[PDB]
Design an enzyme around this catalytic site. Structure first.
Site, PDB file in Angstrom:
ATOM      1  N   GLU A 268     103.284  54.775  38.079  1.00  0.00           N
ATOM      2  CA  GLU A 268     102.805  54.826  39.459  1.00  0.00           C
ATOM      3  C   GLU A 268     101.368  54.371  39.696  1.00  0.00           C
ATOM      4  O   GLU A 268     100.556  55.065  40.396  1.00  0.00           O
ATOM      5  CB  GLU A 268     102.919  56.283  39.947  1.00  0.00           C
ATOM      6  CG  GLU A 268     101.996  57.303  39.233  1.00  0.00           C
ATOM      7  CD  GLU A 268     102.595  58.047  38.033  1.00  0.00           C
ATOM      8  OE1 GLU A 268     103.481  57.531  37.315  1.00  0.00           O
ATOM      9  OE2 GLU A 268     102.122  59.178  37.742  1.00  0.00           O
ATOM     10  N   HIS A 292     111.046  57.338  42.786  1.00  0.00           N
ATOM     11  CA  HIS A 292     110.200  58.198  42.034  1.00  0.00           C
ATOM     12  C   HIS A 292     108.716  57.696  42.027  1.00  0.00           C
ATOM     13  O   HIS A 292     107.792  58.476  42.371  1.00  0.00           O
ATOM     14  CB  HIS A 292     110.704  58.247  40.625  1.00  0.00           C
ATOM     15  CG  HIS A 292     109.891  59.106  39.714  1.00  0.00           C
ATOM     16  ND1 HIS A 292     110.226  60.427  39.463  1.00  0.00           N
ATOM     17  CD2 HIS A 292     108.815  58.826  38.937  1.00  0.00           C
ATOM     18  CE1 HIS A 292     109.360  60.932  38.618  1.00  0.00           C
ATOM     19  NE2 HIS A 292     108.507  59.981  38.271  1.00  0.00           N
ATOM     20  N   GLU A 293     108.504  56.453  41.587  1.00  0.00           N
ATOM     21  CA  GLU A 293     107.156  55.893  41.591  1.00  0.00           C
ATOM     22  C   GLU A 293     106.520  55.913  42.975  1.00  0.00           C
ATOM     23  O   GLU A 293     105.353  56.195  43.106  1.00  0.00           O
ATOM     24  CB  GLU A 293     107.114  54.441  41.057  1.00  0.00           C
ATOM     25  CG  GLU A 293     107.697  54.320  39.651  1.00  0.00           C
ATOM     26  CD  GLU A 293     107.275  55.361  38.632  1.00  0.00           C
ATOM     27  OE1 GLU A 293     106.129  55.771  38.653  1.00  0.00           O
ATOM     28  OE2 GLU A 293     108.095  55.746  37.750  1.00  0.00           O
ATOM     29  N   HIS A 296     105.119  59.361  43.799  1.00  0.00           N
ATOM     30  CA  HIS A 296     103.828  59.598  43.135  1.00  0.00           C
ATOM     31  C   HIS A 296     102.648  59.209  43.965  1.00  0.00           C
ATOM     32  O   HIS A 296     101.529  59.672  43.655  1.00  0.00           O
ATOM     33  CB  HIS A 296     103.700  58.845  41.818  1.00  0.00           C
ATOM     34  CG  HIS A 296     104.318  59.537  40.678  1.00  0.00           C
ATOM     35  ND1 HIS A 296     103.963  60.824  40.308  1.00  0.00           N
ATOM     36  CD2 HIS A 296     105.244  59.119  39.789  1.00  0.00           C
ATOM     37  CE1 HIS A 296     104.632  61.153  39.217  1.00  0.00           C
ATOM     38  NE2 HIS A 296     105.382  60.109  38.863  1.00  0.00           N
ATOM     39  N   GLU A 315     105.158  65.776  37.824  1.00  0.00           N
ATOM     40  CA  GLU A 315     106.513  65.247  37.715  1.00  0.00           C
ATOM     41  C   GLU A 315     107.577  65.997  38.527  1.00  0.00           C
ATOM     42  O   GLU A 315     108.460  65.404  39.135  1.00  0.00           O
ATOM     43  CB  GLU A 315     106.932  65.052  36.240  1.00  0.00           C
ATOM     44  CG  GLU A 315     105.981  64.081  35.559  1.00  0.00           C
ATOM     45  CD  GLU A 315     105.961  62.649  36.169  1.00  0.00           C
ATOM     46  OE1 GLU A 315     106.878  62.203  36.871  1.00  0.00           O
ATOM     47  OE2 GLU A 315     105.001  61.940  35.969  1.00  0.00           O
ATOM     48  N   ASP A 372     101.551  62.401  24.015  1.00  0.00           N
ATOM     49  CA  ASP A 372     102.644  61.472  23.792  1.00  0.00           C
ATOM     50  C   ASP A 372     103.730  62.076  23.000  1.00  0.00           C
ATOM     51  O   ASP A 372     104.880  61.673  23.173  1.00  0.00           O
ATOM     52  CB  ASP A 372     102.173  60.190  23.121  1.00  0.00           C
ATOM     53  CG  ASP A 372     101.314  59.312  24.061  1.00  0.00           C
ATOM     54  OD1 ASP A 372     101.488  59.350  25.319  1.00  0.00           O
ATOM     55  OD2 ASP A 372     100.450  58.577  23.526  1.00  0.00           O
ATOM     56  N   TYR A 380     109.795  67.243  34.186  1.00  0.00           N
ATOM     57  CA  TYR A 380     110.593  66.650  35.275  1.00  0.00           C
ATOM     58  C   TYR A 380     111.704  67.558  35.736  1.00  0.00           C
ATOM     59  O   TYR A 380     111.831  67.786  36.907  1.00  0.00           O
ATOM     60  CB  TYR A 380     111.233  65.318  34.889  1.00  0.00           C
ATOM     61  CG  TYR A 380     110.298  64.238  34.465  1.00  0.00           C
ATOM     62  CD1 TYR A 380     109.758  64.231  33.195  1.00  0.00           C
ATOM     63  CD2 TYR A 380     110.023  63.165  35.294  1.00  0.00           C
ATOM     64  CE1 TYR A 380     108.926  63.191  32.757  1.00  0.00           C
ATOM     65  CE2 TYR A 380     109.188  62.131  34.881  1.00  0.00           C
ATOM     66  CZ  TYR A 380     108.624  62.154  33.617  1.00  0.00           C
ATOM     67  OH  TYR A 380     107.744  61.153  33.199  1.00  0.00           O
TER      68      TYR A 380
HETATM   69  C1  LIG Z   1     101.824  63.516  28.980  1.00  0.00           C
HETATM   70  C2  LIG Z   1     102.265  62.242  29.695  1.00  0.00           C
HETATM   71  C3  LIG Z   1     102.311  60.999  28.774  1.00  0.00           C
HETATM   72  C4  LIG Z   1     103.226  59.832  29.177  1.00  0.00           C
HETATM   73  O1  LIG Z   1     102.929  59.042  30.373  1.00  0.00           O
HETATM   74  C5  LIG Z   1     103.887  58.621  31.295  1.00  0.00           C
HETATM   75  C6  LIG Z   1     105.082  59.285  31.450  1.00  0.00           C
HETATM   76  C7  LIG Z   1     106.068  58.868  32.343  1.00  0.00           C
HETATM   77  C8  LIG Z   1     105.896  57.796  33.165  1.00  0.00           C
HETATM   78  C9  LIG Z   1     106.963  57.417  34.162  1.00  0.00           C
HETATM   79  C10 LIG Z   1     106.866  58.223  35.457  1.00  0.00           C
HETATM   80  O2  LIG Z   1     106.561  57.763  36.587  1.00  0.00           O
HETATM   81  N1  LIG Z   1     106.837  59.491  35.232  1.00  0.00           N
HETATM   82  O3  LIG Z   1     105.901  59.879  34.288  1.00  0.00           O
HETATM   83  C11 LIG Z   1     104.705  57.097  33.034  1.00  0.00           C
HETATM   84  C12 LIG Z   1     103.717  57.496  32.107  1.00  0.00           C
HETATM   85 ZN   LIG Z   2     106.673  60.289  37.158  1.00  0.00          ZN
END
Ligand SMILES: CCCCOc1ccc(CC(=O)NO)cc1
Ligand SMILES: [Zn+2]
Ligand SMILES: [Yb+3]
Ligand SMILES: [Yb+3]
Ligand SMILES: [Yb+3]
Length: 607
Positions: A268, A292-293, A296, A315, A372, A380
């Protein structure tokens, strides 16, 4: 305390603006330039401050036209290395200065992927993209790399003149580079304060096509026409979202379709959503990722998690709004279908991690944990489930949407915690506090596992999926003949996907059932990435050797982690494909996205 950052916290000083001047060097795989940070002291007599960095080479730090002293501390793993800067004059509270840092990135920057001409569609030009969420902006430039701080920015980016640069910002013009006529300088401006995780850059041979009054789609030429069609519901989703969330404050809503190694479904980035090309199904069937995006733009980008412990704020609300957008377009029965799907995905994650595992908590403690690595569906879907439960408890979607809109207005431009949210929730629904105090807060927010209560879901669209899944699970060999392509005739692509999700939850099936399934339904021919993903997992888990090349090919021709990680994992758990999975990973690893390469490595236990 932001336990993912080593920088001085927001109680000490706050970045108000970044002015970035840099040059993209594809021969060295480096971004080289200056980051000029306008920093405001929040303390009396401030004489030093600390910034996050990761694999950055610092040339010098200039303040008031002179070089100053700075030191880089020892590297702390995924967090990088702290940069302490000695200010030349002590600052009083609210005093602002500009600190100009000359820097260069490492070709191994975890924020970036550098792709040669051959990894692109066009095959003539190279390509660069960034991904800062959660804590990779420090691997691009020195910064207070915490979502508790929000800043505006401007930037000038020099690139070979045949290529195009874009960023999470409004395009503010382009000129030839005065110091190098083989190059162009693109300029950018983001007037809305953002956390630094929303700083984004792509450089490549990009073309654009207009698809709405405030939306261009960008990609390489080969993908333009397909992308414009795939995402043509974008303006209608923005109008719904504005209705639910309030005014869209960001000016443009553009989309960029990345090369296949993009690690997520979408990101996003303000003014310029990044999306995976695995959305290009040909029928707009995966457009919920766009919804979704788009969502955000309110939940996340305007109202932001103060630390990554509170990621679910970002999320879960976004998923709640997303599903509303899809419910307005496609019907309330479809919103219930998608919600019930989400619950199934939550059950999968909980089973995968284990029902007592700390990462199955809604609010997670990230001390010494790489974000990560903790990243999953939990924030979510447990977040969405909590909000859907509340919706049902408090009187329905109309009433709850009134809360969500007030929540966004309330916390616009700020960064907040789960307690902030909770206290506003109580304030807004003060006439229903009695109902709220029935909620098991400690369990919902802080306990691992499935939530203590499951919401109620309409079953209309799900029934057909369950019934067919159940026929196949309970079939014996002498029932296999009764299956036929007509079983699928009244099912949408979403329902096909849910049938496979349902079946996959009971995997393995006998090999001869899976073979019959290919014989009658021809799932091998389906290019929808969600369906193909779940089908191939079902094949590999049920030990069909023929599926091995198909699974390897999908795992490596695209790099969306959602797909690539479980495909590799399934391939590594199957003894017949194990050695090939590891060999294929080792062969592709240098040309993979750095985060993906890291996580697939851990999953397969290879180094
Ligand atoms: C702790 C988060 C690390 C990962 O980053 C990200 C995680 C998910 C997304 C997609 C989305 O729009 N929902 O997140 C983009 C970056
Ligand atoms: Zn997201
Ligand atoms: Yb301008
Ligand atoms: Yb220059
Ligand atoms: Yb190979």
């Amino acid at each position: 305390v932001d336990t993912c950052s080593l920088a001085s916290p927001a109680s000490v000083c706050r970045t108000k603006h970044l002015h970035l001047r840099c040059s993209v060097d594809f021969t060295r795989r480096t971004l080289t330039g200056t980051a000029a940070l306008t920093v405001q002291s929040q303390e009396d007599n401030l004489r030093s401050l600390v910034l996050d960095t990761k694999d950055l080479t610092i040339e010098k730090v200039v303040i008031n036209g002179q070089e100053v002293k700075y030191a880089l501390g020892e590297r702390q793993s995924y967090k990088g290395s702290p940069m302490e800067i000695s200010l030349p004059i002590a600052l009083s509270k609210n005093q602002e200065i500009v600190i100009e840092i000359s820097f260069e990135t490492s070709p191994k920057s975890s924020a970036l992927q550098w792709l040669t001409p051959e990894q692109t569609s066009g095959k003539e030009h190279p390509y660069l993209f960034s991904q800062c969420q959660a804590i990779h902006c420090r691997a691009i430039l020195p910064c207070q790399d915490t979502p508790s701080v929000k800043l505006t920015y401007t930037a000038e980016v020099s690139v070979p003149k045949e290529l195009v640069a874009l960023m999470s910002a409004i395009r503010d013009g382009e000129t030839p580079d005065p110091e190098d006529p083989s190059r162009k300088i693109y300029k950018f401006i983001q007037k809305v304060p953002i956390p630094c995780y929303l700083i984004a850059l792509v450089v490549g041979a990009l073309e654009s096509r207009q698809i709405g009054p405030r939306t261009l789609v960008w990609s390489e030429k080969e993908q333009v026409e397909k992308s414009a069609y795939e995402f043509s519901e974008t303006e209608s989703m923005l109008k719904i979202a504005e209705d639910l969330g309030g005014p869209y404050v960001w000016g443009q809503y553009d989309l960029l379709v990345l090369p296949p190694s993009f690690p997520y479904g979408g990101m996003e980035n303000p003014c310029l959503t990044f999306v995976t090309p695995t959305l290009l199904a040909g029928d707009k069937s995966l457009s919920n990722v766009i919804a979704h995006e788009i969502s955000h733009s309110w939940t996340g980008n305007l109202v932001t998690n103060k630390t990554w412990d509170h990621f679910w704020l970002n999320e879960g609300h976004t998923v709640y709004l997303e599903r509303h957008i899809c419910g307005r377009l496609f019907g309330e029965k479809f919103r219930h279908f998608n919600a019930l799907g989400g619950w199934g995905e939550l059950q999968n994650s909980v089973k995968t991690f284990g029902e007592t595992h700390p990462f199955t908590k809604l609010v997670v403690d990230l001390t010494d944990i790489d974000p990560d690595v903790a990243y999953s569906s939990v924030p979510y879907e447990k977040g969405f489930a909590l909000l859907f439960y509340l919706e049902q408890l408090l009187g329905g979607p109309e009433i709850f949407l009134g809360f969500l809109k007030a929540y966004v207005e309330k916390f616009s431009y700020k960064s907040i915690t789960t307690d902030d949210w909770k206290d506003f929730l109580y304030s807004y629904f003060k006439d229903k506090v009695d109902v709220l105090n029935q909620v098991d807060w400690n369990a919902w927010l802080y306990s691992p596992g499935l939530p203590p209560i499951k919401p109620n879901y309409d079953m209309t669209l799900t029934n057909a999926c369950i019934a067919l899944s159940q026929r196949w699970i309970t079939a014996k060999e002498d029932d296999l003949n009764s299956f036929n392509a007509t079983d699928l005739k009244d099912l949408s692509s979403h329902q096909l996907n849910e049938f496979l999700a349902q079946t996959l939850q009971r995997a393995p099936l006998p090999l001869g059932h899976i073979k019959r399934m290919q014989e009658v339904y021809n799932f091998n021919a389906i290019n929808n990435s969600e369906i193909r993903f779940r089908w191939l997992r079902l094949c590999i888990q049920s030990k069909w050797e023929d599926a091995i090349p198909l699974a390897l090919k999908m795992a490596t021709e695209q790099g969306r982690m959602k797909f690539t990680r479980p495909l590799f994992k399934d391939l590594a758990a199957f003894d017949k494909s194990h050695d090939q999975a590891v060999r294929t990973y080792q062969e592709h690893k240098a040309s993979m996205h750095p985060v993906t390469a890291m996580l697939v490595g851990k999953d397969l236990k290879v180094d």
